[PDB]
Amino acid sequence: GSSGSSGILQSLSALDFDPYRVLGVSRTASQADIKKAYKKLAREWHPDKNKDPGAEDRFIQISKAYEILSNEEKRTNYDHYGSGPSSG
């Protein structure tokens, strides 16, 4: 059996890009999992060692994804909105 698998599943994001999806974690992930995942991604995908064109892009995002969660104020805000339409 050379190959055989399927995973047809649609999706819909609330904002330009989701933080959890960027960092690569789920709701179950807590400040701990997210944090470690952030630094780990920032260090590994760090532009300091990365020379190939594009690496930076990823990093710039990875940092942004966490910036939201990492921050208490930012994190909470999201929850309040419940991934819905902003008041204004």
Q: Pull the structure tokens for residue 76.
A: 């909470």
Distance, CA of 61 to CA of 84 (rounded, Å): 22
Q: How many residues does the chain have?
A: 88
User: Which method was it determined by?
Assistant: NMR
Distance, CA of 73 to CA of 80 (rounded, Å): 11
Interacting residues of 47 by C-beta distance below 8 A, sequence separation 6+: 55, 56, 59
Domains assigned to the chain = 17-88 (1.10.287.110)
